[PDB]
Nucleic acid binder design. Structure first.
Ligand code: MG
Length: 476
RNA sequence: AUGGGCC
RNA sequence: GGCCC
């Protein structure tokens, strides 16, 4: 978005930290072009003359303003997508109880009991367990008073800027392109879950191309479902965004919230209001307070869902701005936040859509290599989604999610102290789809030091997971 | 080190 | 706890 004000205050919010990711035995074997993101300004790995603080907020370039006619078009697209979504999900969207918002429901998992509480709780000590009883599903006086202000629509907050401690390609580590997490206050998260929690639960349960959302999916199982769907289409596109989250303009955000979360769809009047508080935000980074207009914070409840919904409306908006007679059945798509797979039997010109996405402030580029524009004829076996390719298994005849071996090497090369064993088992479930030979090669540095699951055991587990009859058919 | 998923 | 977004 657009940075409107940068104020220096006395209170310093500690963010820097040291990386908790330590190199494993695999690091010296694979030597990946990957490493922990730069968390300190004095990190020796950083390029000369790179100020980490400036690069972080460089994503905030502008808040794109839309014309009345483009806003009118966007409203129509939001309402059209909002028609499809609530037709599939239903309109049972009344507030969740406090208990349900904390403990979760069918389709919505519970709030994490010991994550960051946000501001101003971080400046007072106080963890999440002191403010909220997670076992009993009850809130203390501090949150109670905050919830009363949100009901009154008088609630004010600040986002706490956190540096994301993660493995990144070495090019981005050296460029100081450390990702950030905007940690919202725990009460804001709770109330959002109250306002839109059942909707979110319904979204998760009904994931698929019909609603254009993969949020809630299990790639082990659903790659067959998504794979067979997109294989039916003549053209498949792999579309990359540049800073998707930060580039959501105030106009697009406000209109989407207005059209999707209407009281006539069963929502409480405050559902629209609580989401609109995400448009103009105050961010706290050390001694600096930065006011931003536009863009989506990442620590919000249902940030993935909001981004997914916007992604759906963006594609409809861009296509209607270029072509005539474009409807929801003109194409098909699945998204997860900024990640997107689009397909159509019509020879759509995504290169011509570039300016139309720009009117929203979004920059689309081909993922199909960083090549000379968008091309036609590509299939689902050519694309990546959720860092996974669509490969066929020749033992079952099903699509399986295959990650790049270079990426799996990177994941196995770094781990938090004392978590290596459980990480290996977790990564084994990802690595099984690379085939027996590659699975063997990936875990070979760990042999004799940790338990590695046999390829066979994870394969048979997966066969049953994707299709229970297929596992039984091998016994018939 | 986080929202939201999934093991 | 890990992974993806
Ligand atoms: Mg992509």
């Amino acid at each position: 978005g657009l940075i409107v004000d940068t104020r220096d205050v006395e209170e310093r919010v500690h963010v820097m930290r040291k990386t908790k990711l330590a190199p494993t035995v695999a690091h010296g074997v694979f030597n990946p072009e990957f490493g922990p993101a730069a968390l300190s300004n004095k990190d020796p790995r950083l390029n000369e003359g790179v100020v980490l603080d400036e690069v972080i907020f460089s994503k905030h370039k502008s808040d794109t303003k839309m014309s009345a006619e483009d806003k009118a078009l966007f409203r129509r697209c939001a309402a059209d997508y909002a028609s499809r979504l609530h037709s599939v999900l239903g309109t049972a969207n009344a507030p969740l109880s406090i208990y349900e918002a904390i403990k979760g429901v069918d389709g919505l998992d519970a709030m994490e009991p010991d994550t960051a509480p946000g501001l101003p709780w971080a400046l007072q000590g106080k963890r999440r367990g002191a403010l909220i009883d997670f076992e009993n599903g009850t809130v203390g006086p501090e949150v109670e008073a905050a919830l009363k202000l949100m009901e009154k629509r008088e609630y004010k907050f600040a986002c706490q800027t956190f540096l994301k401690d993660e493995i990144r390609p070495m090019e981005k580590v050296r460029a100081g392109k450390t990702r950030i997490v905007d940690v919202l206050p725990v009460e804001h998260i709770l109330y959002t879950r109250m306002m839109i929690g059942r909707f979110c639960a319904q979204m998760h349960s009904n994931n698929g191309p019909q609603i254009g959302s993969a949020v809630g999916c299990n790639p082990d199982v659903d790659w067959q479902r998504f794979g067979t769907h997109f294989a039916q289409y003549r053209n498949v596109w792999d579309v990359d965004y540049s800073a998707f989250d930060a580039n959501h303009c105030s106009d697009a955000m406000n209109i989407m919230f207005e059209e999707v979360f209407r009281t006539e769809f069963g929502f409480h009047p405050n559902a629209e209001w609580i989401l609109k508080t995400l448009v103009n935000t105050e961010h706290a980074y050390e001694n600096k307070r930065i006011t931003v207009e536009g863009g989506m914070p990442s620590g919000c409840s249902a940030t993935s869902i909001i981004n997914t919904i916007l992604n759906n409306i963006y594609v409809l908006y861009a296509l209607r701005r270029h072509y005539e007679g474009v409807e929801l059945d003109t194409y098909t798509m699945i998204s997860y936040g900024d990640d997107i797979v689009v397909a159509s039997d019509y020879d759509l010109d995504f290169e011509a859509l570039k300016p139309h996405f720009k009117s929203l402030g979004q920059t689309i580029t081909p993922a199909d290599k960083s090549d000379k524009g968008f091309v036609l004829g590509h299939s689902i076996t050519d694309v990546t989604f959720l860092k996974r390719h669509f490969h066929m298994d020749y033992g079952t005849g099903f699509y399986k999610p295959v990650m790049a071996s270079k990426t799996l090497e990177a994941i196995l090369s770094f781990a938090r102290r004392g978590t290596i064993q459980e990480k290996l088992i977790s990564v084994a479930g990802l690595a099984v789809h690379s085939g027996p030979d590659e699975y063997r090669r990936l875990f070979e540095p760990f042999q004799g030091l940790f338990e590695i699951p046999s390829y066979r055991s994870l394969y048979l587990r997966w066969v049953n997971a994707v299709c229970g009859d297929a596992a039984a058919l091998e016994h018939h």
